Design an enzyme around this catalytic site. Structure first.
Site, mmCIF file in Angstrom:
data_model
loop_
_atom_site.group_PDB
_atom_site.id
_atom_site.type_symbol
_atom_site.label_atom_id
_atom_site.label_comp_id
_atom_site.label_asym_id
_atom_site.label_seq_id
_atom_site.Cartn_x
_atom_site.Cartn_y
_atom_site.Cartn_z
ATOM 1 N N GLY A 1 10.464 -51.667 6.886
ATOM 2 C CA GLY A 1 9.577 -50.813 6.112
ATOM 3 C C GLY A 1 8.111 -51.113 6.347
ATOM 4 O O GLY A 1 7.291 -50.197 6.462
ATOM 5 N N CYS B 1 11.933 -63.033 -1.647
ATOM 6 C CA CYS B 1 11.383 -62.908 -2.985
ATOM 7 C C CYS B 1 12.329 -63.413 -4.060
ATOM 8 O O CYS B 1 11.901 -63.581 -5.204
ATOM 9 C CB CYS B 1 11.029 -61.442 -3.273
#
Ligand SMILES: [Zn+2]
Ligand SMILES: [Zn+2]
Length: 815
Positions: free
Chosen positions: A356, A432
């Site tokens: 992305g 994350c």
DNA sequence: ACTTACGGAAGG
DNA sequence: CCTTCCGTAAGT
């Protein structure tokens, strides 16, 4: 198991103690002043009546920056702060050096005790930058402060005509922007107006009492209006009593433009319209030049040389109009005639995912991702499917870093590793999971090693010395462990000699129907310009736009000025997936047909222009029979979730009957329901008592765990939650689960979970972007990604820096 | 391989 | 007090 982080020696001696178990008197002289504050004597000119004076250009010690105690106790930072001082306060001459980067800085990666400085510091935005090159007392702080105060004053230029009540002008200037009669202006929504005139059954629904907030997730009821657009007709200043123009009270007259939602045809008129389409009007307004929020280009559509679709993509702030709008006739007209008239960076993406970030950077035209590192095989295969000219190492990043820090030149597969000088830009979103606030096991070794990969990423940046550096993470990265990880990242970057800054961005403000707050760390090499963060393009809900960061009880904001409004309207769930055909729970057909053409601007952007009828990945996870019945019993009202499920017995899709949840214990906080019934499902409702390992109830349409632990979890708001057409998605995560922590994943109307295609569209992926694996791998690739529109905004910000540097070089070489 | 049960800090 | 939301570990 997880691998320990590979480090250069520089990165090691900064993160050493944090990841212990996871890493493998003359003008020009500086003085000290009793508070000690270190200053540079910019002038010793004796001022009268106040003793011998001197101008002190203050240094800011690194302990007074965002670095804090993480900083070097001898590093100073230049700041834009100075003042006149007595000479009776100088203690003694201190030695301060300017540590400059070498010409071999790009290859210093991998290898006294006096005050030194290497960077100028912006304390509002936490921007470490190269020392400003202001060419001449000569206090640099005074020169910069003057040249700043003199760009924010709006000034008229090129007087056009002098009448008796007002002086007309041809041009004005404000904040370094030049406006002429005929240009488009942004205005606050409040600048002008348009001529158009604008009991529950507690026994059948026993969890409804937990919806007592009236706040609805993903609701667009409070998002502000976009900018008013106008065309400048007359710049003028009113004359004073002295007969001369008031050059400070600059007024402009404006032809108002309508957006399709501004006409008598309300918000529904925006569903199919272009996001930058306007309607000319003959209505006029008068505003103050101070109100102008920016310049924009508003062109007549059928007098443009190219197609309006080719014009819209050319640059920012580009609008067009094809028709005029008669307000009090409520009709559409033809407009009157007085209205018609660099080489890409070489990029290394560490923790690339499906791509992305690389996609957003590619469509910004700044970058060519030549190398990607991605351990998870489906995500790496998707990257290869989307980047045929890229090299994807399906390998742990630590192993590859260790290989390159020796003269390996090639991994075990026969893939040529990048060497120093090859990497111009380093980007990446490190894992994350250990930083995300959804992770309630973030103190365990799994999350420790996940978080330690930031050190790997910084070691990559230290070794390769790229021109630009980008770290993406969840918002919680800026505050994890009292902001120690962020402080240590910025300390490492400054120790390398990078100009660096950090901020938090909202993806929804760049063109997705999703709230997604991400922390971004930007860094640039000494010779480069440090990029600014991008201005918001789309208005978004204010609750989703909390972007400030508190580090050691000091607030830090990015450079963004578009706080409330913006040029474009919000993207909604309707803009996102209104075109996609109906499908069922458990969809498995990979390639199907669209049942028509795209119905919104966003769908047109995501599908393209050419007629391609093959829609991929419109597949939904197969939920069990009980979960299916639950999704059938979720009503269609906005804000519907588990809490309005009925407490009934349901004949499931198989030979099984879901039973009614029994309420066995008296919840003292929630009290009894109106029928005198209980509201607790386990003994733990009493403060200070262990759960009873028999109160756990099974095969209930109302899940038992949600009332079990809702009182300390915001009543599990959003679980089994439907989306609304007018609203936006919640944060797209790796697995859309109605009982997940972020569980608002039900279709607005269809009795199913959102599709993989619908999750990719919530993330701004082009319909042609290839995903890989089974349905869970695809959901994870989509939910991990940086939304391409956000990466594109950031990429355009970096393109600005590239163009600036190239222009200054060309001017320096064609003297 | 799938399902469920579910901690605590930042910031408003 | 309410909301946040690249999820994990233990059970199944
Ligand atoms: Zn000064
Ligand atoms: Zn209990």
């Amino acid at each position: 198991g997880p691998t320990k982080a590979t480090t250069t020696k520089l990165v090691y001696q900064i993160f050493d103690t944090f990841f212990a178990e996871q890493i493998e008197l003359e003008v020009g002289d500086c003085v000290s002043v009793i508070p000690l504050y270190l200053a540079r004597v910019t002038a010793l000119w004796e001022d009268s009546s106040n003793g011998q004076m001197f101008h002190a250009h203050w240094f800011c010690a690194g302990t007074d920056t965002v670095l804090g105690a993480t900083s070097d106790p001898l590093e100073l930072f230049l700041v834009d702060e100075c003042e006149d001082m007595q000479l009776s306060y100088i203690h003694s001459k201190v030695k301060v050096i300017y540590k400059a980067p070498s010409e071999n800085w790009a290859m210093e990666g991998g290898m006294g005790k006096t005050y030194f400085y290497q960077l100028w510091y912006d304390q509002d935005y936490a921007r470490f930058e190269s020392p400003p090159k202001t060419q001449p007392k000569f206090c640099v702080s005074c020169a910069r402060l003057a040249e700043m105060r003199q760009k924010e004053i709006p000034r008229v230029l090129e007087q056009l005509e002098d009448l008796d009540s007002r002086v007309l002008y041809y041009s004005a200037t404000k904040n370094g922007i030049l406006y002429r009669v005929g240009d488009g202006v942004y205005l606050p929504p409040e600048a002008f107006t348009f001529n158009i005139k604008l009991p529950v059954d507690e026994d059948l629904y026993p969890e409804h009492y937990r919806k007592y907030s009236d706040y609805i997730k993903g609701s667009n009821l409070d998002a502000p209006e976009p900018y008013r657009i106008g065309r400048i007709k007359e710049i003028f200043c009113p004359k004073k009593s002295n007969g001369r123009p008031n050059e400070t009270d600059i007024k402009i007259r404006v032809n108002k433009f309508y957006r399709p939602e501004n006409t008598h045809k309300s918000t529904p008129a925006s569903y199919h319209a272009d996001i930058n389409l306007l309607y000319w009007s003959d209505e006029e307004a008068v505003v103050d030049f101070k109100a102008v929020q920016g310049r924009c280009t508003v062109e007549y559509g059928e007098d443009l040389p190219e197609c309006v679709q080719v014009y819209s993509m050319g640059g920012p702030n580009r609008f067009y109009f094809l028709e005029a709008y008669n307000a009090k006739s409520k009709s559409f007209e033809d407009p009157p005639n007085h209205a018609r008239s660099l080489p890409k960076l070489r990029t290394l993406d560490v923790f690339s995912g499906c791509g992305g970030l690389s996609e957003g950077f590619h469509q910004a035209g700044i970058s060519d991702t030549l190398w990607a590192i991605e351990m998870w095989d489906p995500a790496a295969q998707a990257f290869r499917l989307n980047n045929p000219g890229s090299t994807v190492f399906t390998e742990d990043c630590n192993i590859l870093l260790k290989l390159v820090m020796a003269g390996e030149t090639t991994n075990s597969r026969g893939q040529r590793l990048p060497q120093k000088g090859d990497v111009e830009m380093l980007c990446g979103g490190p894992p994350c999971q250990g930083f995300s606030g959804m992770n309630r096991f973030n103190s365990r070794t799994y999350s420790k090693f996940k978080n330690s990969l930031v050190v790997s990423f910084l070691s990559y940046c230290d070794y390769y010395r790229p021109r630009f550096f980008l770290l993406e993470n969840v918002r919680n990265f800026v505050s994890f462990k009292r902001s120690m990880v962020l402080k240590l990242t910025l300390r490492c970057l400054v120790r390398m000699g990078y100009q660096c800054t950090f901020g938090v961005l909202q993806a929804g403000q760049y063109g997705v129907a999703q709230t997604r707050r991400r922390a971004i760390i930007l860094a640039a090499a000494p010779g480069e310009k440090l990029p600014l963060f991008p201005e918001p393009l789309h208005v978004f809900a204010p609750r989703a736009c909390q972007l400030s960061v508190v580090v050691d009880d000091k607030k830090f904001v990015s450079n963004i000025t578009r706080l409330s409004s913006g040029p474009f309207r919000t993207i909604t769930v309707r803009d996102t997936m209104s075109d996609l055909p109906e499908v069922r729970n458990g969809a498995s057909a990979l390639e199907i047909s669209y049942n028509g053409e795209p119905q919104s601007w966003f769908q047109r952007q995501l599908r393209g222009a050419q007629y391609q009828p093959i829609l991929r990945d419109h597949i939904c996870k197969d939920m069990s029979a009980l979960v299916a019945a639950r999704m059938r019993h979720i009503p269609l009202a906005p804000g519907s979730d588990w809490r309005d499920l009925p407490n009934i017995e349901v004949r499931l899709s198989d030979g099984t009957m879901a039973r009614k949840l029994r309420y066995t214990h008296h919840d003292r906080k929630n009290g009894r329901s109106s029928s005198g019934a209980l509201r607790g499902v386990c003994s733990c409702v009493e403060a200070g008592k262990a759960c009873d390992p028999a109160a756990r109830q099974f095969n209930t349409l109302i899940p038992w765990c949600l009332p079990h632990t809702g009182n300390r979890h915001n009543h599990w708001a959003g679980l089994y939650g439907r989306l609304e057409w007018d609203g936006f998605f919640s944060t797209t995560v790796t697995n859309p689960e109605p009982m997940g922590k972020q569980g608002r994943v039900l279709h607005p109307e269809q009795h199913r979970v959102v599709s993989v295609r619908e999750c990719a569209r919530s993330q701004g992926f082009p319909d042609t972007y290839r995903l890989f694996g089974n349905i869970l791998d695809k959901h994870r690739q989509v939910g991990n990604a940086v939304p391409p529109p956000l990466a594109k905004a950031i990429g355009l910000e970096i393109k600005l820096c590239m163009l600036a540097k190239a222009r200054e070089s060309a001017s320096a070489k064609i003297k």
